[PDB]
Amino acid sequence: APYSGPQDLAALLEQIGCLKYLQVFEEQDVDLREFLTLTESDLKEIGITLFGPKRKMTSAIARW
Amino acid sequence: ELTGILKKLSLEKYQPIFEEQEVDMEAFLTLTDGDLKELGIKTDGSRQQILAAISELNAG
């Protein structure tokens, strides 16, 4: 259905061009539900250390 | 695109920051004064020019 949220974390990351980070999240057992609870510093702590991807992720989290 | 924006502002010296930090256009258009300081652009005038460019792009 159009304009619904991503079905899973891979879907979200694909949308924001961040699939290069999917396995980092998977290794920490972070699924979509947990991802949507993360703060900026949580993302940095997991290894999303670059400004661009971290910003696209915080934007996505706020969006969904 | 980004490299062209910086070129037109005569601020291509900052391109390596955006490239290494993987700042694409989507991310670039969200950048605030604080973000530019954090990225390392300490020169006030540089931030003023970049933010003005971002503002015009987001206008409307």
Numbering used by the authors:
A (entry chain A): 3 to 66
B (entry chain C): 8 to 67
Give verbatim lines from the article.
Recent work has revealed that ANKS6 interacts with a related protein called ANKS3. SAM domains consist of approximately 70 amino acids and adopt a globular structure generally containing a core of five α-helices. The protein-protein interactions of SAM domains are typically mediated by two distinct surfaces on the domain, termed the mid-loop (ML) and end-helix (EH) surfaces. Here we define the ANKS6/ANKS3 interaction by discovering that the ANKS6 SAM domain binds to the SAM domain of ANKS3.
To prevent ANKS3-SAM polymerization without destroying ANKS6-SAM binding, we mixed an ML-surface mutant of ANKS3-SAM, I36E, with wild-type ANKS6-SAM. The ANKS3-SAM/ANKS6-SAM heterodimer crystallized in space group C2221 with four molecules (2 ANKS3-SAM I36E mutants and 2 ANKS6-SAMs) per asymmetric unit. By solving a crystal structure of the ANKS3-SAM/ANKS6-SAM heterodimer, we observed that the EH-surface of ANKS3-SAM binds the ML-surface of ANKS6-SAM. Additionally, the overall structure of ANKS3-SAM I36E aligns well with ANKS6-SAM (RMSD across backbone atoms is 0.626 Å) with the only obvious difference being a 1.6 Å outward shift of ANKS6-SAM’s helix 3.Similar to the ML-surface of ANKS3-SAM, the ML-surface of ANKS6-SAM contains a shallow hydrophobic patch (residues V30, A34, L38, L46) flanked by negatively charged residues (E29, D31, E33, D42, E45). Many of these charged residues form salt bridges with ANKS3-SAM (ANKS6 E29 + ANKS3 K22, ANKS6 D31 + ANKS3 K58, ANKS6 D42 + ANKS3 R57). The ANKS6-SAM structure also shows that the EH-surface is lacking a large hydrophobic residue flanked by positively charged residues, thereby showing that ANKS6-SAM cannot polymerize because its EH-surface is incompatible with binding its ML-surface. R823 (R54 in the crystal structure numbering) forms salt bridges with D51 of helix 5 and D40 of helix 4, and forms hydrogen bonds with the backbone carbonyls of I48 and K49 which both lie on a loop between helices 4 and 5. Through these interactions, R54 is involved in stapling helices 4 and 5 and in maintaining the overall fold in this segment of the domain.
